[PDB]
Amino acid sequence: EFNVYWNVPTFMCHKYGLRFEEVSEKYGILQNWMDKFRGEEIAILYDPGMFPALLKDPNGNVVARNGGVPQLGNLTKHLQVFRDHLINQIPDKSFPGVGVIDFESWRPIFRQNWASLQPYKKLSVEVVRREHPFWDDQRVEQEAKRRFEKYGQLFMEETLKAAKRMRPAANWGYYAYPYCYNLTPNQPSAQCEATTMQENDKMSWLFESEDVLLPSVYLRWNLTSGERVGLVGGRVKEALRIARQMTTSRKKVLPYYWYKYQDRRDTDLSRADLEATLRKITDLGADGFIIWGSSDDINTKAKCLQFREYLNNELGPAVKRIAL
Numbered sequence: 183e184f185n186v187y188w189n190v191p192t193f194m195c196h197k198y199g200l201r202f203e204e205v206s207e208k209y210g211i212l213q214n215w216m217d218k219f220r221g222e223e224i225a226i227l228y229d230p231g232m233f234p235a236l237l238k239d240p241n242g243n244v245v246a247r248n249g250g251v252p253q254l255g256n257l258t259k260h261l262q263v264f265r266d267h268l269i270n271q272i273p274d275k276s277f278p279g280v281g282v283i284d285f286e287s288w289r290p291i292f293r294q295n296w297a298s299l300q301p302y303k304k305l306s307v308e309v310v311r312r313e314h315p316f317w318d319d320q321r322v323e324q325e326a327k328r329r330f331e332k333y334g335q336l337f338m339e340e341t342l343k344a345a346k347r348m349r350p351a352a353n354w355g356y357y358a359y360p361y362c363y364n365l366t367p368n369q370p371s372a373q374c375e376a377t378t379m380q381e382n383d384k385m386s387w388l389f390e391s392e393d394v395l396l397p398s399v400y401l402r403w404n405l406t407s408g409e410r411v412g413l414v415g416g417r418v419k420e421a422l423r424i425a426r427q428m429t430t431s432r433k434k435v436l437p438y439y440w441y442k443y444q445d446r447r448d449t450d451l452s453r454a455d456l457e458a459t460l461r462k463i464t465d466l467g468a469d470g471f472i473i474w475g476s477s478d479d480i481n482t483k484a485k486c487l488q489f490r491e492y493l494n495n496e497l498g499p500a501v502k503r504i505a506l
Contacts, residue, residue: 183469183470184464184468184469184470184505184506185212185436185469185470186210186211186212186470186471186472186473186501186505186506187211187212187213187223187224187280187436187470187471187472187473188205188206188211188212188213188214188223188224188473189224189226189282189472189473189474189475190473190474190475190480190489191219191475191476191477191480192205192217192475192480192486192489193217193218193219194477194480194481194486195480195483195486195489195490196217198483198486198487200486200487200490201216201217202217202490202493203217204493204494204498205217205493205498208498208502209498209499209501209502209506210501210502210506211473211498211501211506212224214279220271220272221279222274222277222278222279223279223280224279224280224281224282224472225271225272225277225279225280225281225282226282226284226357227267227268227271227272227281227282227283227284228284229284229285229286229287230263230264230267230268230271230283230284230285230341231260231261231263231264231265231267231341232247232248232259232260232263232264233247233248233252233255233260233285233287233337233341234246234247234248234249234250234251234252234254234255234260234287234288234337235247235248235250235287235288236250236251236287236301236302236305244301248260250302250305251288251302251305251306251309251330251333252288252330252333252334252336252337253306253309253329253330253332253333254309255333255337257336257337257340260337260341261340261341261344264341264344264345265344265348268344268345268348268349269348272349272352275348275349276351277349277351277352278351278352279352279353280352280353280355280394280436280472281345281349281352281353281354281355282355282356282357282396282472283341283342283345283354283355283356283357284356284357285338285341285356285357286357286358288302288334289334289361290331290334290335290338290385290388291331291334291381291384291385292306292326292327292330292331292334293377293381294361294378294381296368297367302330303326303330306326306327306329306330307322307323307326309326310322310325310326310329335387338356338388339387339388339391342354342356342388342391342392343391346391352393353393353394353434354392354393354394355392355393355394355395355396355436356388356392356396357396357398357438358396358397358398358438359385359388359389359392359395359396359397360382360385360389360395360397360420360421360424361378361382361397362374362375362378362397362416362417362420363375363378364412364413364416364417365402365405365409365412365413365416372409372412372413372415372416373416374416374417374420379420379423382420382424389424389425389428389433390428390429390430391430392433393431393433393434394433394434394435394436395421395424395425395433395434395435395436396436396437396438396472397417397418397420397421397435397437397438398417398437398438398440399413399414399417399418399437399438399439399459399463399471400438400439400440400444401413401414401440401443401444401451401455401459402443402444402445402446403443403445403446403449404445404446407454407455407458410455410458410459411458411459411462414437414459414462414463415462415466417437418435418437418462418463418466418468419466421435421437421468422435422466422467422468434469434470435467435468435469436468436469436470436471436472437463437468437471437472438471438472438474439459439463439471439472439473439474440473440474440475441473441475441492441497442475442476442479447479450492450496450497451496451497453496453500456496456497456500456504457500457504460500460501460504460505461504463505464504464505470505471505473497473501475489
């Protein structure tokens, strides 16, 4: 089987009379009943509970939500808020659909918190310096890294188990794991960075307890045709690699797919990119893919009509002829 899921917030277009019934009626895409955003087929939860995170105010200041870094956070407070969000957004206890937890504040591996996520390393190190003024550099750094990676793990594993316990028939997964970093400043080519694969092997606690793996395979316009396919190919092969190593049960590989170029958001994917990239996901043996969209791209009547036009002339037909 191969299943395509609709995770575009087309519920925002319903007050103009566009209900997008053709998503499932003509193209065979799995869609929540009545085109609701959260329902029996799929539900995404953006930043749920109260994960420790570093936020920057408009005032300029750094706001540390629930500690900033996970070693300074309160798990029980996080877990109770996570409970309220889950209950409200997924009220049905027998929800059998794909459950996606979208949490992107920090990565659980200390090293992977580079570029814009560097402040998490800095503050982790800083706290240890405060407690131990005489410790040498190497020592402080090592201890900072062990505390971040222990509690980082703990926050992620305990939220997944709480979701699994309260909605035991759902297929749960974290958005964007496993990472690969191909065609990125850290790894210029189309293969995943070698250290990240080893780090993915070390994260068996995550991949063993999830049901679905969801690498994000968003295309960029400033790439050649072959690299757009290599971009997808690399990430999905990494996910399939992990999945066939898992021991507790079959894992599903459902890549997150966007119909806009991420570096050129006002341009929808060309027909040639849709075909080559959906053909690649299919050829590799993935179990399906999830079509996503942003609120900012269909928050007006004009944006809804144009999206609906793109859907019926290109996206829909491409999904039906290549994938279903």
